[PDB]
Write an enzyme that holds these catalytic residues in place. Structure first.
Site, PDB file in Angstrom:
ATOM      1  N   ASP A   1      -7.143  17.634  92.025  1.00  0.00           N
ATOM      2  CA  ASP A   1      -5.725  17.491  91.726  1.00  0.00           C
ATOM      3  C   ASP A   1      -5.302  18.202  90.449  1.00  0.00           C
ATOM      4  O   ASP A   1      -4.152  18.044  90.028  1.00  0.00           O
ATOM      5  CB  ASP A   1      -5.346  16.013  91.628  1.00  0.00           C
ATOM      6  CG  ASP A   1      -6.264  15.241  90.715  1.00  0.00           C
ATOM      7  OD1 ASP A   1      -7.381  15.729  90.475  1.00  0.00           O
ATOM      8  OD2 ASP A   1      -5.868  14.164  90.221  1.00  0.00           O
TER       9      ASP A   1
ATOM     10  N   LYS B   1       4.762  28.525  39.022  1.00  0.00           N
ATOM     11  CA  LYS B   1       3.865  27.978  38.014  1.00  0.00           C
ATOM     12  C   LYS B   1       4.642  27.287  36.902  1.00  0.00           C
ATOM     13  O   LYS B   1       4.290  26.176  36.488  1.00  0.00           O
ATOM     14  CB  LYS B   1       2.981  29.092  37.450  1.00  0.00           C
ATOM     15  CG  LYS B   1       1.589  28.641  37.026  1.00  0.00           C
ATOM     16  CD  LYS B   1       0.591  29.795  37.076  1.00  0.00           C
ATOM     17  CE  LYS B   1      -0.837  29.310  36.868  1.00  0.00           C
ATOM     18  NZ  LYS B   1      -1.847  30.316  37.304  1.00  0.00           N
TER      19      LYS B   1
ATOM     20  N   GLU C   1      -1.356  11.044  80.191  1.00  0.00           N
ATOM     21  CA  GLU C   1      -1.519  10.173  81.340  1.00  0.00           C
ATOM     22  C   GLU C   1      -1.789   8.738  80.900  1.00  0.00           C
ATOM     23  O   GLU C   1      -2.132   8.465  79.750  1.00  0.00           O
ATOM     24  CB  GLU C   1      -2.668  10.639  82.223  1.00  0.00           C
ATOM     25  CG  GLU C   1      -4.033  10.307  81.654  1.00  0.00           C
ATOM     26  CD  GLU C   1      -5.102  10.218  82.712  1.00  0.00           C
ATOM     27  OE1 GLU C   1      -4.756  10.313  83.905  1.00  0.00           O
ATOM     28  OE2 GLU C   1      -6.288  10.065  82.345  1.00  0.00           O
TER      29      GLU C   1
ATOM     30  N   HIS D   1       1.174  10.993  85.569  1.00  0.00           N
ATOM     31  CA  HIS D   1      -0.117  10.758  86.234  1.00  0.00           C
ATOM     32  C   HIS D   1      -0.405   9.259  86.391  1.00  0.00           C
ATOM     33  O   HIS D   1      -1.444   8.757  85.960  1.00  0.00           O
ATOM     34  CB  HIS D   1      -1.235  11.478  85.459  1.00  0.00           C
ATOM     35  CG  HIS D   1      -2.538  11.639  86.196  1.00  0.00           C
ATOM     36  ND1 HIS D   1      -3.508  10.660  86.219  1.00  0.00           N
ATOM     37  CD2 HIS D   1      -3.074  12.707  86.837  1.00  0.00           C
ATOM     38  CE1 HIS D   1      -4.559  11.095  86.895  1.00  0.00           C
ATOM     39  NE2 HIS D   1      -4.327  12.339  87.272  1.00  0.00           N
TER      40      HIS D   1
ATOM     41  N   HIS E   1     -11.173  18.576  88.289  1.00  0.00           N
ATOM     42  CA  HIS E   1     -10.750  17.709  89.378  1.00  0.00           C
ATOM     43  C   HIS E   1      -9.842  18.484  90.324  1.00  0.00           C
ATOM     44  O   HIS E   1      -9.120  19.391  89.897  1.00  0.00           O
ATOM     45  CB  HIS E   1     -10.023  16.493  88.821  1.00  0.00           C
ATOM     46  CG  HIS E   1     -10.930  15.360  88.473  1.00  0.00           C
ATOM     47  ND1 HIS E   1     -10.552  14.333  87.635  1.00  0.00           N
ATOM     48  CD2 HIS E   1     -12.189  15.077  88.876  1.00  0.00           C
ATOM     49  CE1 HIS E   1     -11.551  13.479  87.519  1.00  0.00           C
ATOM     50  NE2 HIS E   1     -12.554  13.903  88.266  1.00  0.00           N
TER      51      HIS E   1
HETATM   52 ZN   LIG Z   1      -8.560  13.961  86.539  1.00  0.00          ZN
HETATM   53 ZN   LIG Z   2      -6.418  13.381  87.291  1.00  0.00          ZN
END
Ligand SMILES: [Zn+2]
Ligand SMILES: [Zn+2]
Lengths: 633, 590, 496
Positions: free
Chosen positions: B70, B455, B201, B407, B68
Site C-alpha cells: 500500500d 560586535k 499516521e 492512514h 509495504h
Molecule cells: Zn505500512
Molecule cells: Zn501502511
C-alpha cells in the site's frame, strides 16, 4: 582564520583550524617511520636475530653495545617499536573542541589524543571508517602485544648520541615524544567517544558552523570534509581517488566555490601506473607459482587487498592455477571480510547493482565458497594443519617490522625460489628490508597507489578555482628522487603557502559579514525608500535576540545625510504659511532671514546653520522641517 | 503557504498518497494501491494533480517511505503508462526490495484478477532504473531550493521518516513507523527540528499496547506448552517483516532453551528476504550490528526450508507459513491437513480483514468455509505500528506547529485530535481524500549584517545596561540579490553620499547684573552642577563644553541688561541641546 | 644556567615562528627545572613576552604553567601573572593562556585566602570577556577558587547567557561548588528547571545532575523531590541515550520519594491478567533502548527497592518477565537485583518461569546466578517447594557439573525455611507404609541432593527422626562424615 599543522608527514596529518568561536581539528597521524627504525619483533626468537652483533660507540662511554645492534653494516635500535606522535603541545587539545576524521589510516592515532591529553568534545567519522579503524587498532595492539618485549633504551634517545649516530638514526626527527603503544581500554574509550555520520549529512555546531562529509573515494568510507558558515567555505581534501575504484566516486560539486582549500593525502609514488603494476604483479605471481614456491604479500585489511583479490581472481581464472591456494592471515581477517561484505551503499554503482541483483558485491565470498582463498586468524593451529607448498600468503602488517610477515620471511629467507611482493607505498622498502639482508628471497617492488597524481591535482584545482590553497612543503618542493622533473611539483595561481612540522599559518581572509534573520512583522513594518536607481534603503529600529550563536531581530540613533535646497526651502515655507522671508547669496552659500523669531540660516556645501532667539515651538517646527527635507541613514 | 491534498488514505486505510505544495513546489509523498477495490479506484486519482497534463512538468519530486504494498505498489502505474520521468527518492533497502514484491503482486494479480491495463515486468525494471537512492541523514538537494532528509522509522526494514525543508519551511512526513524497539528493528529517532507541519499516521491510536517483552513471554510460554505436548504449530504470517522478527525471536529462544525439535519456514520468498536481511545489516539496530562481530544473526542454525512431506511427517512441529490473511493459503492447506487433531496450535499475530476466511477463523464458530476446526487458536498482537503514547511522545519530541492525520479510521482519528488538542494545544487537521487544506507560513527573509557593527552592539548588550531600548539602527542595502544591514557610516562610505552636518546655535538671553566672564563661569558651574555624569569641561578660551555642545559667551549686545550665550550643537546631541536651552531659559542662579 | 642559556639562544636566534616554537618545545619536552631557577626562567619569559607572535606567547604561558605545576613558585609568579593579565588584553588565545596559567597558579599549591585566590577571583570577575574568550575558563576558575562558606548573581546570569558551552562550564562549576559544599539555594532549583528546558544537548545532561543535587539537598518547595522526580522521568523519555543513562543512574542515586508517586511511575497488563488467572516512567525506561539504559534502569530499581520496604512486588513481576532480555549482561544484572531485593518476598506463581530460567543451555554464569537466587529467595507454599525440587533435579540430571552449587543452594533452602518440607517427607523418598523399601544408592547425586535438604530441614524441627528409615540413619552418618560443610550436626539416636 588560523591553521596549526602538527604533522610534517604529507599523508598523516593533524590540522587544528581555528574559525569563528570554535576549534575544529582534522585527522590523526601515527607515523610508523620510527617503527621502521626499530628492530623487528619475531613471534618466535630466531637464532640470527638473537645473536645479531652489538654496534658500539666509538668513544665507548655509552652502553650502545646492548642498547643497539648492528646487521649487514647497518644499525638498528633494540626495544619495543615506538610510534611518532604529532606535537600535541602547540595548542591545548582540551581547548580544541571538535575532531573530524577522514579515514581509518587518519584515525590510527586516536587513543593518544582522546585519553591522555584531556580533550572532552565530540569526534566525527563515518561508519566504514570507524569500523575498519577499530579492526586496524585491534591488529596493531595485538601485534605490539602477543609477545611482550618490554626492553626500552633511552641513552640513544639522548640528543648528543643521536647526533653521533649515523643516518638514518642521524636523520631521526623528534625522538623525544615517541611513545609506547596503547591498549584495549584506551581503544574502547575512544571508540565509545566516537559519534556517527553519513555522506552529505549537515552537522550543526552551536549554530556557529556546519560540517558535511563527501566521498573522497580512496578508501571505503574515506571522506573529505567541508566546513561552512553562511559566507565562508573551507574544503579540506585529504586522500581522494578520482579513478574508477570500489568506493563511492569523488564528488566535487560541493567541493567547488571554496574560500580556503587545504589539500593533503596525495600520492607517494607519482610515476606509478596502478593497473599496469597490478598486471606486473599478476605476471610475477604466475612466474613464482609456475616455479613452484611461496609468495608473500604484506597488506592492510582494506582497499588494496580487495582490488588485488579481484584481479587475482581474474588472473587465476586466466592462467589455470586453481591448484595453488591463497591464505589470508591476520587476526582481523574474518571481521574484515564480513564488514567489506555488508558495506554496500558506500560502494559504486556497479557493486550496488550487484547487491540489487542478489549477489555479494565482492567476489572473494565466491572465492571462499570455491575454497581457493582461506582466511586464518593466526598461524598457530589449524593453519599449521592446512599449510601447503607452493602457496600464496597475504599477511597482516605491511610495515614489516612485526607480525606474521616477519615470522614467515624468517622462515623463508634462506630459500631463493620464494618471492616477496610489496604492495603498499607508505614506506621505503629499502629501509623496510634492511634487517633481513642478506636475503635470498626475490624482491619485486610494485607499489599500488590510488591517490591522485599531480596532473589530476592540476585538473581539479583548475576545475574548482579556490581563493586560497594550503599544501605541504614536501609538495611545494621538488622531490629528492627526481628534482629535474617539473610536473612533480604542485602549481597553482596564486602559489600555495607551505608549512613544516608544528607550524602556524594565518590564512588570507578577514571576517566581514555573517547570517542574521529578520522577523516577518518587522519586515512588514519596514518600508524601503530609494535615493539611487536600483538602490532602495530603510532605516532600522529593532531588538536583537541571539540564542546559540544564531541572530534575529524583532521590534521593541540614526543621523542625517543630504543637502537642503534654499529655493525649495523658501517655496515650501511660503506654501506652509511662513511669509516675509528674504534670501541673499554668498560665494558658496545662501543666507536666508525669516523675520519671525529673527531666524537667520546659512546654507553652504555640507554646512547648514540655524540661529534664532529663545524660542521653542518655532524651533521644533523648524526641527521637523529640516529633518524631513533630507534622507535618514 | 502549505497545500496538502491526500489522494488516498483520507479517513481511510490504504492507497496512501499525499500531494504537498510548498512555495510552489510539488512533492508527492508515497503512492500505493489498496486491496478491496478491484476497480481502478484502488489506484490514486490523477485527474486532480495533472488532470491530463504532463506529470514531470507539473510535479517536481517523489518520495517513497517503505516497501509495504500500500505504499510502493503504484510506482510503475504512476510512472510508466501514465508517464513520469522525474526524480524518485527512496532508500537503498526499499529500492532493493520493492521490485520483488511488485513482481509477486503482478503475478498474483494475473492469477487472480488479470487486469488488461496492468504494469509489466520490463517497465517495472525501467521504473526501478529511474529511481534514485539516498542514505540516512543525507541532505539531498532535488534542486537548488528544495532539499530532503531521511530519519529512521522502524515500521519495517528500510523504512524512513522524511523531513522536507525549503528555506525555513519544514514538513515532516512520518509514513508508517514505530516507537517500540523491535527484536531486530530499532526505534525511530528524530532531531528536534521544530517542523512547520507534521504529517502522520495513527493506525492504533485508541489502543494502549502494553509491555512488548511480556507479550513475547506469553507467546513463548504457550509455544513451549505446545511443543512439550508434542503438537504442531502453524504460524500464518506474511513473508515480510514480522516473519523475520519471529524468526530471530525463535532462533534466540530455541538456542537458549537448547532444544532439538526441527522447525521450518515457508519457501518462495524466504531466500530473497533472508538475503536482503543479511545484506542490509546497518538498519537492524545496534544489537544485531554489534553481534555481527562474532556471528551473523540472520544466518539461521535451526531454521530450514519447509517440505510438504515434512508436513505429514509426525512428531512435534513448528512451521511459519504464508499468508497472514489466508486468502490462498498453503498455510490453509496445512490447516486443513491438521484441523482434525485437538493437540495442535495456531497463533494469529495480526489483524485479519473482516468478512474473509481469516475472519471466520478469528470468530469462534467451528464450521468455516465447510470444515470443522478442532485444533486450538490464539489471537496475539505482534503489530509493529505506533500507539497513542508513542504518538504523543513523537509529537512532544518533534514539537511541530500543526499536525495532519492519515492512514486510519475516522472515530479514532477524532479521538486523537481531541486528545492532542487538549494536551499540547497544537492545531490538527483531518483531511478527507480529495480535499485540499491550506496552512499559512512565516517566510522570514534572510539579510546580511556587518560583523563590526554586530560586535559593538553585542558588546553594548552584554554591558549591564539591558532591558532598556538600545534602538538597533542602521540601514538595509537592497540589491534584490543580497539584502544586507549596514551601519550609517558604512552606508555613507559605500554609497559616496556626503556626511551632512546640521548645526543649531541658540542665543540664550540672560538678564542679570553679573559680569559676562563671570556669566560664562556661572554657565560652566551651573551645567556641571545640574547635569550629573555629563562631560562638562571649561575650555580655556572661556568656553563651556557639555559632551559635544559648545557654549560661548558672545559679544556684548546693544542691551546692557541682556547677555548673549551662543549654545551650539549638532542633531545627534540635539535632545541635550534642547535640554540645555530649556535650563538656560529657566536661567542661571543669581 | 640552562634557562639563561636557553633565553640567550632564543634572543640570539629571534626567528619569528621557527626558533620560538623550537625553543619552547625543547624547553617543555626536555625536563622539569626541578629547582628554584623556575622563578628566574619565568622572569626571562616575562621579559621576552613583550613581543609579537601571540601564539608563541600562549605557548610560553603554557610552559610557565607547566613549570608552576612543580610547585616551586608562588607569590612572585602570582604577581607577575596578575600584571600580565592586566596588561596583556590581546585576543582569545592569549586570554585563554592567561586563564590557564591563573588556574595552574591557583590550584598548584597555596589553596589559601589573602590574595592567594580571592584576588585572582576578583581579577577574573573584572576580566570576564565579551565573546567566549575566557567565560568558560573564568567560570571554572571561580569554581576551583570558590571563595568561602558564607558569586550567585553572576552564575545565575551565566546560566542564561549566550553559549551552551559557557552554560555547561557554569554547570561544571556548580559541581565543583557542591563537592566543596557551598550550600546552594532554591532559586538554583528554579533556574535549573529552566535549564532543563534548554532545547540543546548535554546542557540538559549536566543540568539534570544539578536538579538531582538540589533535590537531594532539600525537599521544600510547595513537593520538591516529587516534582524533581517527575521532571527526571519526563526527561528519561528523551531520545538521547547518554542523557538517559545519566538520568537513570542519578534517579537511582535518589533514595527518598513519595511512595504513591513511585507506583504512579510504575503504573501503565498481562501480569495482573495472569494473577487473576492464578487466583509511565519505568514502563518505558526499561524497554526503551538497549543494554546501557537497561543496566542503568535495573541498578536504579535495585537501589530504590532496597530503600523502600514496599513496592517490591510491582518490580518483582517487571524483573521476572525481563529475564530474557537477549543481552547476557542484562540477564546477570536482573538476577543480581532480584537477589538484592529478595527480602520479605513471595513468588507464589513466579516460581515456574523463574525456574524455566535456570533450565538453560550452557550459560554457566546465568545458571550459577539463578542457583544463588534460589538459595537466597523465600517461598510460601509446599507445592512450590515440591516443584522447585523437581526442576532442580531436572537441572542436576541435565548438567551434572554444578551439583556442588545445587547441593549448597538446597542446603540454604532447608536452613532458610524448614517447616515447609514436612508433608513431603513420605513422598520425596519412597517409604512404602509397610514394605521393606530397598536401600537407596549412596553416592547417587540426586539422592544426595534430596538428603542434604532433608537434614538442613531437620536442623530445627525434631519431628522426623522417627520418620526416617534405617538407611537414612547410616546415610546421615556417611554424609556427616563426608560433606562436613553441607549437612549440620543433628540429634539422631544412632549418632549421639
Ligand atoms: Zn505500512
Ligand atoms: Zn501502511
Amino acid at each position: 582564520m588560523k591553521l596549526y599543522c602538527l604533522s610534517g608527514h604529507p599523508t598523516l596529518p593533524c590540522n587544528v583550524l581555528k574559525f569563528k568561536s570554535t576549534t575544529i581539528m582534522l585527522d590523526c597521524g601515527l607515523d610508523m617511520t620510527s617503527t621502521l627504525n626499530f628492530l623487528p619483533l619475531p613471534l618466535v626468537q630466531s637464532p640470527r636475530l638473537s645473536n645479531l652483533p652489538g654496534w658500539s660507540l666509538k668513544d665507548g662511554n655509552a652502553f650502545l653495545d646492548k642498547e643497539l645492534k648492528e646487521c649487514s653494516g647497518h644499525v638498528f635500535v633494540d626495544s619495543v617499536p615506538e610510534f611518532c606522535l604529532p606535537e600535541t603541545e602547540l595548542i591545548d587539545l582540551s581547548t580544541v573542541d571538535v575532531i573530524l576524521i577522514s579515514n581509518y589510516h587518519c584515525m590510527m592515532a586516536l587513543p593518544y589524543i582522546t585519553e591522555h591529553t584531556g580533550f572532552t568534545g565530540t569526534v566525527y567519522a563515518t561508519e566504514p571508517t570507524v569500523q575498519i579503524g577499530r579492526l586496524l587498532m585491534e591488529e596493531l595492539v595485538n601485534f605490539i602485544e602477543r609477545v611482550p618485549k618490554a626492553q626500552s633504551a633511552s641513552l640513544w634517545k639522548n640528543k648528543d648520541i643521536q647526533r653521533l649516530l649515523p643516518s638514518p638514526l642521524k636523520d631521526a626527527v623528534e625522538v623525544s615524544t615517541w611513545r609506547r603503544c596503547y591498549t584495549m581500554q584506551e581503544v574502547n574509550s575512544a571508540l565509545s567517544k566516537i559519534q556517527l555520520v553519513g555522506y552529505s549529512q549537515k552537522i550543526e555546531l552551536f549554530g556557529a558552523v556546519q560540517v558535511t562529509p563527501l566521498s573522497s573515494g580512496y578508501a571505503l568510507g574515506s571522506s573529505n570534509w567541508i566546513i561552512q558558515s553562511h559566507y565562508e567555505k573551507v574544503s579540506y581534501v585529504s586522500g581522494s581517488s578520482l579513478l574508477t575504484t570500489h568506493p563511492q566516486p569523488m564528488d566535487q560539486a560541493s567541493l567547488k566555490n571554496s574560500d580556503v582549500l587545504v589539500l593533503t593525502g596525495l600520492t607517494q609514488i607519482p610515476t606509478a601506473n596502478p593497473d599496469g603494476m597490478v598486471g606486473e604483479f599478476c605476471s610475477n605471481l604466475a612466474l613464482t607459482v609456475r616455479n613452484g614456491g611461496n609468495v608473500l604479500v604484506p597488506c592492510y585489511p582494506s582497499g588494496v587487498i580487495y582490488d588485488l583479490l579481484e584481479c587475482l581472481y581474474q588472473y587465476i581464472d586466466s592462467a589455470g592455477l586453481s591448484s595453488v591456494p591463497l591464505y589470508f592471515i591476520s587476526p582481523v581477517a574474518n571481521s574484515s571480510l564480513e564488514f567489506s561484505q555488508i558495506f554496500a551503499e558506500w560502494l559504486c554503482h556497479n557493486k550496488q547493482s550487484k547487491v540489487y541483483l542478489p549477489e555479494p558485491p565482492f567476489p572473494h565470498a565466491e572465492l571462499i565458497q570455491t575454497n581457493k582463498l582461506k582466511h586464518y586468524p593466526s598461524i598457530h593451529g589449524d593453519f599449521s594443519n592446512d599449510f601447503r607448498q607452493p602457496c600464496v600468503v597475504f599477511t597482516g602488517h605491511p610495515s614489516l617490522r612485526f607480525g606474521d610477515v616477519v615470522h614467515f620471511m624468517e622462515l623463508w629467507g634462506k630459500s631463493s625460489l620464494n618471492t616477496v611482493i610489496f604492495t603498499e607505498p607508505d614506506f621505503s622498502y629499502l629501509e623496510a628490508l634492511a634487517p633481513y639482508q642478506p636475503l635470498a628471497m626475490k624482491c619485486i617492488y610494485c607499489p599500488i597507489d590510488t591517490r591522485l597524481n599531480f596532473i589530476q591535482v592540476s585538473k581539479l584545482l583548475k576545475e574548482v578555482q579556490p581563493l586560497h590553497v594550503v599544501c605541504p612543503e614536501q609538495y611545494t618542493q621538488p622531490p629528492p628522487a627526481q628534482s629535474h622533473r617539473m610536473d612533480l611539483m604542485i602549481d597553482c595561481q596564486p602559489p600555495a603557502m607551505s608549512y613544516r612540522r608544528a607550524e602556524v599559518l594565518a590564512l588570507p581572509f578577514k571576517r566581514r559579514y555573517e547570517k542574521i534573520e529578520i522577523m516577518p512583522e518587522l519586515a512588514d513594518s519596514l518600508v524601503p525608500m530609494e535615493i539611487k536607481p536600483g538602490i532602495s534603503l530603510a532605516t532600522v529600529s529593532a531588538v536583537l535576540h541571539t540564542k546559540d550563536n544564531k541572530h534575529l531581530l524583532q521590534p521593541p540613533k540614526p543621523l542625517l545625510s543630504g543637502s537642503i535646497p534654499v529655493e525649495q526651502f523658501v517655496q515650501t515655507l511660503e506654501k506652509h504659511g511662513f511669509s516675509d522671508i528674504k534670501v541673499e547669496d554668498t560665494a558658496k552659500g545662501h543666507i536666508v532671514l525669516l523675520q519671525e523669531a529673527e531666524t537667520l540660516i546659512q546654507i553652504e556645501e555640507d554646512s547648514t546653520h540655524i540661529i534664532c532667539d529663545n524660542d521653542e515651538m518655532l524651533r521644533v517646527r523648524l526641527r521637523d522641517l529640516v529633518l524631513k527635507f533630507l534622507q535618514k541613514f | 503557504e502549505i497545500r496538502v491534498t491526500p489522494l488516498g488514505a483520507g479517513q481511510d486505510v490504504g492507497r496512501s498518497c499525499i500531494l504537498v505544495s510548498i512555495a510552489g513546489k510539488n512533492v508527492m509523498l508515497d503512492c500505493g494501491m489498496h486491496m478491496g477495490f478491484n476497480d481502478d479506484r484502488r489506484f490514486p486519482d490523477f485527474s486532480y494533480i495533472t488532470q491530463n497534463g504532463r506529470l514531470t512538468d507539473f510535479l517536481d519530486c517523489v518520495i517513497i517511505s517503505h516497501f509495504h504494498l500500500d505504499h510502493c505498489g503504484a510506482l510503475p502505474y504512476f510512472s510508466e503508462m501514465v508517464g513520469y520521468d522525474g526524480p524518485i527518492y527512496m532508500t537503498h533497502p526499499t529500492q532493493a526490495i520493492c521490485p520483488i514484491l511488485l513482481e509477486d503482486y503482478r503475478k498474483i494479480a494475473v492469477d487472480k484478477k488479470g487486469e488488461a491495463n496492468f504494469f509489466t515486468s520490463q517497465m517495472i525494471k525501467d521504473c526501478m532504473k529511474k529511481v534514485v537512492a539516498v542514505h540516512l541523514h543525507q541532505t539531498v538537494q532535488v534542486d537548488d531550493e528544495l532539499e530532503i532528509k531521511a530519519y529512521y522509522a522502524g515500521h519495517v526494514l528500510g523504512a524512513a521518516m522524511f523531513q522536507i525543508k525549503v528555506g525555513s519551511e519544514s514538513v515532516v512526513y512520518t509514513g508508517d513507523y514505530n516507537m517500540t524497539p523491535d527484536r531486530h528493528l530499532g526505534a525511530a529517532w528524530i532531531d528536534k527540528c521544530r517542523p512547520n507541519l507534521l504529517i502522520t499516521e495513527s493506525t492504533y491510536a485508541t489502543t494502549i499496547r502494553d509491555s512488548k517483552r511480556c507479550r513475547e513471554r506469553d507467546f513463548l510460554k504457550k509455544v513451549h506448552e505446545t511443543v512439550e505436548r508434542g503438537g504442531k504449530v502453524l504460524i500464518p504470517v506474511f513473508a515480510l517483516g514480522r516473519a523475520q522478527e519471529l524468526c530471530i525471536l525463535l532462533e534466540t529462544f530455541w538456542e537458549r532453551m537448547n532444544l532439538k525439535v526441527p522447525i521450518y519456514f515457508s519457501t518462495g520468498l524466504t531466500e530473497k528476504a533472508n538475503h536482503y536481511y543479511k545484506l542490509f545489516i546497518p538498519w537492524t539496530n545496534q544489537k544485531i550490528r554489534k553481534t555481527f562481530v562474532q556471528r551473523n544473526m540472520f544466518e539461521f542454525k535451526h531454521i530450514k526450508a519447509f517440505d510438504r512431506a515434512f508436513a505429514d511427517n509426525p512428531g512435534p512441529m513448528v512451521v511459519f507459513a504464508t499468508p497472514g490473511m489466508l486468502h490462498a493459503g498453503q498455510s490453509l492447506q496445512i490447516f486443513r491437513k491438521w484441523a482434525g487433531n485437538e493437540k495442535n496450535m495456531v497463533i494469529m499475530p495480526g489483524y485479519c480483514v473482516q468478512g474473509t476466511v481469516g475472519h471466520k477463523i478469528l470468530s469462534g464458530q467451528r464450521k468455516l468455509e465447510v470444515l470443522e476446526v478442532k485444533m486450538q487458536v490464539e489471537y496475539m498482537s505482534f503489530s509493529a505500528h505506533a500507539d497513542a503514547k508513542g504518538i504523543m511522545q513523537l509529537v512532544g519530541q518533534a514539537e511541530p506547529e500543526s499536525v495532519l492525520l492519515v492512514h486510519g479510521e475516522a472515530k479514532k482519528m477524532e479521538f486523537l485530535k481531541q486528545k492532542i488538542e487538549q494536551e499540547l494545544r497544537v492545531n490538527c487537521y483531518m483531511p478527507a481524500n480529495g480535499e485540499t487544506v491550506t496552512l499559512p507560513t512565516s517566510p522570514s527573509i534572510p539579510v546580511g549584517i556587518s560583523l563590526g557593527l554586530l560586535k559593538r552592539e553585542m558588546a553594548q548588550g552584554l554591558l549591564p545596561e539591558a532591558k532598556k531600548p538600545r534602538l538597533l539602527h542602521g540601514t538595509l542595502i537592497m540589491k534584490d540579490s543580497n539584502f544586507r544591514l549596514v551601519s550609517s557610516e558604512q552606508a555613507l562610505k559605500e554609497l559616496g553620499l556626503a556626511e551632512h552636518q546640521l548645526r543649531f546655535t541658540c542665543r540664550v538671553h540672560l538678564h542679570d547684573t553679573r559680569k559676562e566672564q563671570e556669566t560664562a563661569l556661572r554657565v560652566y558651574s551651573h551645567l556641571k552642577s545640574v547635569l550629573k555624569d555629563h562631560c562638562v569641561q571649561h575650555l580655556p578660551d572661556g568656553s563651556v563644553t557639555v559632551e559635544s555642545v559648545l557654549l560661548q559667551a558672545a559679544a556684548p549686545s546693544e542691551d546692557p541688561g541682556t547677555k548673549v550665550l551662543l549654545v551650539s550643537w549638532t542633531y545627534q546631541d540635539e535632545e541635550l541641546g534642547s535640554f540645555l536651552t530649556s535650563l538656560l531659559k529657566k536661567g542661571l542662579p543669581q | 644556567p640552562s634557562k639563561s642559556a636557553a633565553l640567550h639562544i632564543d634572543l640570539c636566534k629571534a626567528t619569528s615562528p621557527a626558533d620560538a616554537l623550537q625553543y619552547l618545545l625543547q624547553f617543555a619536552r626536555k625536563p622539569v627545572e626541578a629547582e628554584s631557577v623556575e622563578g628566574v626562567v619565568r622572569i626571562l619569559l616575562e621579559h621576552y613576552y613583550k613581543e609579537n607572535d601571540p601564539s608563541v606567547r600562549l605557548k610560553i604561558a603554557s610552559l610557565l604553567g607547566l613549570l608552576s605545576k612543580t610547585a616551586g613558585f608562588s607569590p612572585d609568579c602570582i604577581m607577575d601573572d596578575a600584571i600580565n593579565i592586566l596588561q596583556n588584553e590581546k585576543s582569545h588565545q592569549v586570554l585563554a593562556q592567561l586563564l590557564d596559567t591563573l588556574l595552574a597558579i591557583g590550584t598548584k599549591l597555596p589553596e589559601n585566602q589573602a590574595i592567594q585566590m580571592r584576588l585572582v577571583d576578583v581579577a577574573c570577575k573584572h576580566l570576564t570577556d565579551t565573546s567566549h574568550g575566557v567565560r568558560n575558563k573564568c567560570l571554572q576558575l571561580l569554581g576551583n577558587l570558590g571563595s568561602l562558606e558564607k558569586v550567585q548573581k553572576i552564575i545565575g546570569d551565566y546560566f542564561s547567557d549566550q553559549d551552551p558551552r559557557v552554560r555547561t562550564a557554569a554547570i561544571k562549576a556548580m559541581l565543583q561548588l557542591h563537592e566543596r559544599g557551598l550550600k546552594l539555594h532554591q532559586t538554583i532549583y528554579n533556574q535549573a528547571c529552566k535549564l532543563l528546558s534548554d532545547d540543546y544537548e548535554q546542557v540538559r545532561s549536566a543540568a539534570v545532575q544539578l536538579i538531582w543535587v538540589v533535590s537531594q539537598l532539600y525537599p521544600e518547595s510547595i513537593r520538591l523531590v516529587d516534582d524533581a522526580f517527575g521532571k527526571i522521568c519526563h526527561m528519561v523519555s528523551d531520545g538521547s541515550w547518554v542523557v538517559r543513562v545519566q538520568a537513570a543512574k542519578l534517579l537511582g542515586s535518589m533514595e527518598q520519594v513519595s511512595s504513591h508517586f513511585l507506583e504512579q511511575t510504575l503504573d501503565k497488563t498481562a501480569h495482573e491478567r495472569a494473577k487473576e488467572l492464578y487466583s509511565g516512567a519505568f514502563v518505558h525506561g526499561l524497554e526503551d533502548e538497549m543494554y546501557e539504559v537497561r543496566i542503568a534502569a535495573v541498578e536504579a530499581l535495585c537501589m530504590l527497592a532496597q530503600s523502600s520496604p514496599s513496592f517490591a512486588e510491582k518490580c518483582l513481576d517487571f524483573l521476572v518477565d525481563m529475564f530474557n532480555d537477549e543481552i547476557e549482561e542484562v540477564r546477570l544484572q536482573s538476577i543480581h537485583t532480584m537477589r538484592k531485593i529478595s527480602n520479605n518476598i513471595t513468588l507464589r506463581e513466579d516460581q515456574l518461569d523463574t525456574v524455566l530460567a535456570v533450565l538453560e543451555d550452557s550459560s554457566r554464569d546465568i545458571r550459577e546466578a539463578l542457583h544463588e537466587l534460589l538459595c537466597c529467595t523465600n517461598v510460601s507454599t509446599k507445592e512450590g517447594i515440591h516443584l522447585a525440587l523437581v526442576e532442580l533435579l531436572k537441572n542436576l540430571t541435565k548438567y551434572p557439573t554444578d551439583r556442588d552449587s545445587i547441593w549448597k543452594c538446597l542446603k540454604f533452602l532447608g536452613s532458610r525455611h524448614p517447616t515447609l518440607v514436612l508433608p513431603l517427607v513420605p513422598e520425596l523418598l519412597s517409604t512404602h507404609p509397610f514394605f521393606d523399601t530397598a536401600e537407596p544408592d549412596m553416592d547417587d547425586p540426586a539422592y544426595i541432593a534430596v538428603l542434604v535438604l532433608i537434614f538442613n530441614a531437620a536442623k530445627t524441627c525434631p519431628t522426623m527422626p522417627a520418620l526416617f528409615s534405617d538407611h537414612t540413619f547410616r546415610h546421615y552418618a556417611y554424609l556427616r562424615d563426608s560433606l562436613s560443610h553441607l549437612v549440620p550436626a543433628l540429634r539422631l539416636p544412632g549418632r549421639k
